[PDB]
């Protein structure tokens, strides 16, 4: 850091090893003031690339309060996402023959859903729905089960394009179009979340507002999933309270999405309150959907801890419930990922090999 020439790599990287968001904000401010375009701009993108949540946000907060506006925009990353979108549009590659042989492999089983998802994976970020629209029209005979996966496909093709994809998905208003096929609305909310992935703030706000003002039947699944996707790691009070209300109301049908959204909003926070709430609700309730969503939540509640996760998972993955075992090991695995943590690998392989419990 103290080398006379402010070379990009060392000062971008050592500061995040030492966890100095204030120091990197200060150096970014000095670069902005001196208006060294290359140094400031490249160091800001390198901070964005190498840093993570709770770090980039802290640095941008301390930077906001000559190129300050540019640094704020590029740390927000909307320009980087736009570059990724335009590259996907340009160098996007599609296979019509594969679309057709997947349509041939379409059968009465879940395989037709598989074909739609594969075609949309190939057509991710195309901003053009003719082949996929025709495929969905051809497969628009088995609904009330495949709407969720079809709207997932529509979300992945039009992800991060709220300028027009928002309207393209809002063209599917559920109430008038199909009251009987109740997954219409859930798929609408789910595609809204998937499309507005990597988008927060106002996205989080209008997701949570329509989730407050709506039914609790099917919309809540996709709504909570999209809300967590938009507020990943944020753990802001309003979405946290909505998710806690949904969880503790015992609405089991949506408790899965509620737990998934809890995990997303407490992504990496290592919130002891959150983990204790999740565990207690686990013993309180006995629904499989609740257990799986809560398993997701406990899975991504924390990562990179190496100080509390070991004891926490020794307590939780040992617990009575196989879902608790699976979620606790999820937590320890993604919390000791990045290094060969001997104790974490020890607990992981031991629970792999000793107990006969299939989960």
């Amino acid at each position: 850091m103290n080398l006379e020439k402010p070379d990009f790599i060392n000062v971008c990287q050592c500061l995040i090893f030492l966890d100095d968001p204030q120091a990197v904000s200060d150096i970014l401010e000095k670069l902005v003031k001196e208006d060294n375009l290359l140094m400031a701009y490249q160091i800001c993108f390198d901070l964005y690339e190498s840093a993570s949540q709770q770090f980039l946000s802290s640095v941008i907060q301390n930077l906001r309060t000559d190129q300050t506006l540019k640094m704020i925009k590029i740390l927000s990353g909307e320009m980087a996402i736009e570059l990724h979108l335009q590259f996907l549009i340009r160098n996007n590659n599609t296979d019509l023959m594969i679309l057709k042989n997947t349509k041939d492999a379409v059968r009465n089983s879940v395989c037709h859903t598989a074909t739609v998802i594969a075609n949309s994976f190939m057509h991710c970020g195309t901003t053009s729905d003719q082949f996929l629209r025709d495929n969905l029209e051809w497969l628009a005979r088995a609904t009330n089960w495949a709407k969720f996966t079809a709207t997932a496909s529509l979300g992945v093709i039009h992800k991060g394009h709220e300028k027009e994809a928002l309207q393209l998905m809002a063209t599917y208003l559920p109430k008038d179009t199909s009251p009987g096929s109740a997954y219409q609305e859930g798929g609408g909310l789910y595609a809204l979340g998937l499309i507005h992935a990597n988008h927060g703030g106002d996205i989080i706000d209008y997701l949570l507002n329509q989730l407050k003002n709506a039914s609790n039947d099917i919309v809540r699944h996709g709504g909570s999933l999209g809300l967590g996707l938009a507020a990943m790691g944020t753990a802001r009070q309003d979405v946290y309270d909505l998710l806690k209300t949904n969880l503790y109301q015992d609405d089991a049908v949506t408790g899965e999405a509620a737990g998934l959204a809890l995990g997303l909003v407490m992504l990496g926070s290592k919130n002891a309150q959150a983990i204790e709430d999740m565990v207690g609700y686990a013993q309180e309730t006995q629904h499989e959907k609740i257990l799986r969503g809560l398993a997701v939540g406990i899975a991504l509640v924390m990562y990179g801890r190496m100080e509390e996760a070991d004891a926490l998972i020794e307590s939780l993955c040992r617990d009575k419930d196989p879902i608790l075992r699976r979620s606790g090991m999820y937590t320890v695995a993604m919390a000791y990922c990045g290094s060969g943590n001997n104790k974490a690998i020890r607990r992981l392989l031991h629970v792999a090999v000793s107990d006969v419990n299939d989960d």
Binding site: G340, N342, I345, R346, L349, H350, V353, S354
Partner: peptide, 25 residues
């Protein structure tokens, strides 16, 4: 370089030897 490379490789291999041995019982 190779010093800590071999240190970590030995740590992981000695761990996995014991862990996989734990299944003999």
């Amino acid at each position: 370089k190779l010093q800590q490379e071999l240190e970590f490789l030995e740590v992981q291999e000695e761990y996995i030897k014991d862990e996989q041995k734990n299944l003999k019982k």
